[PDB]
Enzyme design. Structure first.
Site, mmCIF file in Angstrom:
data_model
loop_
_atom_site.group_PDB
_atom_site.id
_atom_site.type_symbol
_atom_site.label_atom_id
_atom_site.label_comp_id
_atom_site.label_asym_id
_atom_site.label_seq_id
_atom_site.Cartn_x
_atom_site.Cartn_y
_atom_site.Cartn_z
ATOM 1 C CB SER A 47 71.139 -36.080 23.423
ATOM 2 O OG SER A 47 71.532 -35.340 24.572
ATOM 3 C CE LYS A 50 67.812 -33.951 25.350
ATOM 4 N NZ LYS A 50 69.042 -34.633 25.741
ATOM 5 C CB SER A 95 70.998 -32.094 22.982
ATOM 6 O OG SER A 95 71.027 -32.725 21.726
ATOM 7 N NE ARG A 227 77.795 -34.969 17.183
ATOM 8 C CZ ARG A 227 77.073 -34.331 18.088
ATOM 9 N NH1 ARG A 227 76.509 -34.976 19.100
ATOM 10 N NH2 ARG A 227 76.852 -33.038 17.967
#
EC number: 3.5.2.6
Lengths: 242, 241
Positions: A47, A50, A95, A227
């Protein structure tokens, strides 16, 4: 130039994780990472794609603006937030893969490939075909390549209009307060080993910008919040954020 | 355009007097604790940085949000002012001197035409070109702020889309996974009544709530109430968690 700071490995270790964080200090034009090797290992962008996907979709007019609604098709998917109507902003935030697959189809393989090349984006390989290559095709990008791409975006130096770039930077807005603004995009690559999570973006301070790109092994969805947490653990250590 | 006098408690609680105006964009409905004061026009003070930015960008007085405006080396009461700025930090720290310079460069003719074109408040820039929003004739109510902000949000003001996007960038105040607030504070101290403003909007996934509040601000002490009160109201209305 790049400097390896293996001390950041403690933040991965503490969370029983493996990964790389890459930082770039824009003012000083210096980069820092815990793992130079992995910083230069290319992975599926998932993602994080994107970001370029938005830029191209906007610039080609596939997306008119960040308000245009992309209706839920009424197919319940695993991810609850996907089962609702979206615009660019929320499609990015959550996402929403199906929305961007549709963009990719409308963009088509010829224009997608040309634009990625024009962006110098990763290994620029969209094999194939159009609507999944960032998830399970050939396109790969390293953390250092993500920084390079992001830096161009920040500076409106990518090969799309300023408007497109501003809109996408708007859509990347993730967090802001009196101390910093983070514009970023998560990714979670599951289709192909090694399963990894990404977080790429930048931190805007009053007087500097710190670009970051991290990925980490993500054997299960359980670890997805790391993350951000590890990235911030590193940003904090480096006094970039309080 | 509902009056909800229960929100008065949010002012009463802080021994404060003021108005909060909310506009639910989807429902095209407005809510306030005090319809009268919602329509009462005050000096915009630093909330004027929103239109001042738009005009400066559109006329090229500000090239972009990175252009640096060097400190003129005059140490002023507010430390953060005593430094170089760009549009983003000038807005964040409400750096009056930077915007006074913009105003001078814009000049009175273009300023007046633009405020009319914006339908901004009473559109009256009587006074010094570089202070009229602080101590001249311009007056705007909370409901008029909402009207102006709504046009900005929708890129419907009479300046380029780019100008409007940059100013909306510069208005960024707070964001997280629940909401984004784009807003601008003001503090009108020169001319009575001393008031504080906070005007802007809260972007949700599904909706945008515009807000404009002002409140009596007899001393600087109470300045955080601008945001605090607005946010308790937002919280009461379940707009933010």
């Amino acid at each position: 130039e790049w400097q390896e700071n293996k001390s950041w490995n403690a933040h991965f270790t503490e969370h029983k994780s493996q990964g790389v964080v890459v930082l770039w200090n824009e003012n000083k034009q210096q980069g820092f990472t815990n793992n130079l090797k992995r910083a230069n290992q290319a992975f599926l962008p998932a993602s994080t794609f994107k970001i370029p996907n938005s830029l191209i979709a906007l610039d080609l007019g596939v997306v008119k603006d960040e308000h245009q609604v992309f209706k839920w098709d009424g197919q319940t998917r695993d991810i609850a937030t996907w089962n609702r109507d979206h615009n660019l902003i929320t499609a990015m935030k959550y996402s929403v893969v199906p929305v961007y697959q549709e963009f990719a189809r409308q963009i088509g393989e010829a224009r997608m490939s040309k634009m990625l090349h024009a962006f110098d984006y990763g290994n620029e390989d969209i094999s194939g075909n159009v609507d999944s290559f960032w998830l399970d095709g050939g396109i790969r990008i390293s953390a250092t390549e993500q920084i390079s791409f992001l830096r161009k975006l920040y500076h409106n130096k990518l090969h799309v209009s300023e408007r497109s770039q501003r809109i996408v930077k708007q859509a990347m807005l993730t967090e802001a307060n009196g101390d910093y603004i983070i514009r970023a995009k998560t990714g979670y690559s599951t289709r192909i080993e090694p399963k990894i999570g990404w977080w790429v973006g930048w931190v805007e301070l009053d007087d500097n910008v710190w670009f970051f790109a991290m990925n980490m092994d993500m054997p299960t969805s359980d670890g997805l919040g790391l993350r951000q947490a590890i990235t911030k653990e590193v940003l904090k250590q480096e006094k970039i954020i309080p």
